[PDB]
Amino acid sequence: ELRLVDGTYWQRTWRENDGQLYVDDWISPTKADGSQFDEIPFVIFGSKNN
């Protein structure tokens, strides 16, 4: 799960253990210096455009 709240990047993962369904806690990946992000690092490319 990838979300962009108030210009910051957050992501949630769903563990879903074998035979179960478990979910990770919220966390925001940050760059080498910091400052978190302003856009989701997921690009969708297509025949027409991106």
Partner 1 sequence: KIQGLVRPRDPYSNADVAAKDLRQLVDNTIKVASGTPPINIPPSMLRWIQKNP
Of the ranges 3-11, 15-23, 28-36, 40-48, which one interacts with partner 1 (CB under 8 A)?
Answer: 15-23
Query: 21 or 44, CB closer to partner 1?
Result: 21
Q: How far is it, in rounded angstroms, from Cα 21 to Cα 14?
A: 7
- Among positions 14, 20, 41, 46, the unique one binding partner 1 when judged by CB under 8 A: 20
Query: 21 or 32, CB closer to partner 1?
Result: 21
CA angle 46, 3, 28 (to 5 degrees): 120
Q: Is 21 in the site for partner 1 (CB under 8 A)?
A: yes
Contact 41, 30 (CB under 8 A): no
